[PDB]
Amino acid sequence: AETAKPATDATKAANDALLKELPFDDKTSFDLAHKGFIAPLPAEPIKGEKGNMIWDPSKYGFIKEGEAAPDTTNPSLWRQSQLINISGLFEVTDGIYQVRNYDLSNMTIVEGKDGITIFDPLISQETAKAALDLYYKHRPKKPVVAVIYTHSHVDHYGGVRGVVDEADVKAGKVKIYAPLGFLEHAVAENVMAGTAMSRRASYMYGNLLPPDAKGQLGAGLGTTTSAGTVTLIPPTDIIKETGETHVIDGLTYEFMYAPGSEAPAEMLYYIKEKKALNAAEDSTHTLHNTYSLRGAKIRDPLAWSKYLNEALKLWGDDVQVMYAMHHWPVWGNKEVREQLSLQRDMYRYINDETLRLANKGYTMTEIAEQVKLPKKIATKFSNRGYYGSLNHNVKATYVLYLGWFIGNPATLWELPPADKAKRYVEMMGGADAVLKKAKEYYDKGDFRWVAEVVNHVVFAEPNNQAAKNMQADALEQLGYQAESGPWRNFYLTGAQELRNGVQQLPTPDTASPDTVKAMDLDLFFDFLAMRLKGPDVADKHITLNLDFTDLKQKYTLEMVNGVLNHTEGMQAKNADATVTLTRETLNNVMLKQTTLKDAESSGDIKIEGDKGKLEELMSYMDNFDFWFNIVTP
């Protein structure tokens, strides 16, 4: 089995060119990333109760500040990887602390009148607990009086039970603040397309790669994701509009409601006494994703720009420090305004130039080839595509406005990848001839082309290892050149799977107990409907009446024409069966705590009518192999 190759001369030249374009002599990022350092993270890796690795703080130890970029790494991404590994407890300003790099995200702690308020308690309960214990090792041991979730992604709420006990939330001693839409979007994320998204995420975050100079370097936005217990306590206080002001633990918070920017539900806020702005995840030290390669709904760069502009309008004159839920802070009114201004301009440029070029008749990939950020934006390291990339953001923006079809009817009804591949290979003279021609292009450094054309040989002949080896070599050079962590990881993971095959592993975790319980029945029934093997059951008809005795809510589920419909507040006259149960019992079955059959046996699920129909319906539900092929058919 083939292994990683050296960087080609073409790769070295491409990376070296970046040294002239970017000001690597400027070390400002490092000063800011080290500023306010209090204490390092514990060296001991965090392990779960079951012995699983949750967080290894030395994972990317090979990446050291002061060490030159290996020639198999983009030097800008190497610089960023050094920066994101600067870890520990930091002071941002008087009374505001952050723990950085104990997870993908930062945890923030604000000292108020009587206690502390926690922002965005990481992905895992275990990392959040460790981050809070670190804070308490150095700062006074005062109670948590409030938690804020800045937005609806898992790395900003997942560890909540590690910092607060829900008994205190219920008793009114601790309030949890979140933007309008938080709960619905947090819970629904990774449900409907969860297997596709998580398998794609295994490429994105480089989880399958070795951490080394020819492997993964980190995700640009943070190093990687923890792998512990995801928890969720529903918020008690909802922020619904910008201008909203609340006193929390004696400090005055003014909010900006920012839906549809980086996340569906998101908010930024200013603490007036500290002249300190929380930019959430809308301004960090990278160009971010207006579209994530993991696979997600495409975001609106214009809305994002306008939120940054509104932040300037509201706080620009007064702000003294800006911090965010990833990366390090920026200090000084002038400096804060510059970051906000350049990033505002950057997201607007993506929007407006994509639209202008589309109105001129350019199509998706042509527009992405042309759009280049102005020098004043592009020469700041904070605006480089370490997580997002300009190219895939621009493509996504064309799709946001005009969809997938580029208008040329030659592209309306193309054959699928494996089918077109066979025809391409045939017309180019066969697999051997394609590889020989592709080699010439490779030696000229045209790896973008080699990766496209050799992909046809692979999809036509997936057992051709010579083809897979060459495709891997091409992807790998592109990986070596990639400034985006996610780009590098997609390329290098593709190369690895082509050389070695897909490694057979456990499906990872699926849905946390808290997440499942917070899921409304509408979402649950849509998820079951997604799993239905429609073509297998198109001629069949099952109607079930469900009665949830605790909720006093009734539903009709109707499997008909190969789909599963649901309706709240109805009961069918002619149902095959009536199913009576509590919501708790349903959660128990979905969390695989009891089987459907045992729930029926025990009487927790009572059935009137055809006793077999619920089991029958469930027997038509698909199951997904997590490790589906990506770089081969």
Residues making up the annotated binding site for sulfate are 289-294, 299, 387
Q: Copy the structure tokens of residue 25.
A: 């002599």
Q: How many CB atoms lie under 10 A from the CB of residue 218?
A: 29
- State the Cα–Cα distance between residues 557 and 551, nearest whole angstrom: 17
Position closest to Zn ion via CB: 155
User: Could you tell me which residues are annotated as the binding site for Zn(2+)?
Assistant: 151, 153, 155-156, 262, 281, 326
- State the Cα–Cα distance between residues 478 and 480, nearest whole angstrom: 5
Shortest Å distance, C-beta 97 to its own copies: 33
Is 226 a binding residue for Zn ion by CB under 5 A? The answer is no
- State the Cα–Cα distance between residues 524 and 576, nearest whole angstrom: 21
What's at 432, amino acid-wise? D
Nearer to its own copies, 40 or 374 (CB): 374
Question: Distance of alpha carbon 491 from its chain centroid, rounded?
Answer: 18
Nearer to its own copies, 109 or 475 (CB): 475
Shortest Å distance, C-beta 633 to Mg ion: 5
Is 155 a binding residue for Zn ion by CB under 5 A? The answer is yes
Kindly tell me the sign of the dihedral angle through the C-alpha atoms of 140, 142, 147, 148.
negative
For its own copies, which residue of 172, 243, 506, 535 counts as binding (CB under 8 A)? 535
The item of Mg ion, Zn ion, its own copies, none sharing an interface with residue 630, based on CB under 5 to 8 Å by kind, is: its own copies
Classified as helix, coil or strand, 628 is coil
Shortest Å distance, C-beta 356 to its own copies: 6
Name 497's Cβ contacts closer than 8 Å, sequence gap at least 6.
Answer: 208, 630, 631, 632
The answer to whether residues 196 and 204 touch, using CB atoms and an 8 Å cutoff, is: no
The item of Mg ion, its own copies, Zn ion, none sharing an interface with residue 155, based on CB under 5 to 8 Å by kind, is: Zn ion
Is 200 a binding residue for its own copies by CB under 8 A? The answer is yes
Classified as helix, coil or strand, 433 is helix
Shortest Å distance, C-beta 473 to its own copies: 13
- Residues in 280-339 that interact with Zn ion by CB under 5 A: 281
The DSSP secondary-structure symbol of 174 reads S
Is 85 a binding residue for Zn ion by CB under 5 A? The answer is no
Is 136 a binding residue for its own copies by CB under 8 A? The answer is no
Binding footprint of its own copies, residue count (CB under 8 A):
120
Is 534 a binding residue for its own copies by CB under 8 A? The answer is yes
Q: How many CB atoms lie under 10 A from the CB of residue 362?
A: 18
The item of Mg ion, Zn ion, its own copies, none sharing an interface with residue 196, based on CB under 5 to 8 Å by kind, is: its own copies
- Residues in 491-530 that interact with its own copies by CB under 8 A: 491, 493-494, 526, 529-530
CA separation (Å) from 464 to 454, 455, 494, 611? Answer: 11, 11, 16, 52
- Residues in 297-356 that interact with its own copies by CB under 8 A: 297-298, 302, 305, 309, 312-313, 341-342, 344-345, 348-349, 351-353, 355-356
For Zn ion, which residue of 29, 72, 105, 383 counts as binding (CB under 5 A)? 105
The answer to whether residues 151 and 266 touch, using CB atoms and an 8 Å cutoff, is: yes
Site residues (CB under 5 A) for Zn ion?
A: 105, 155, 281
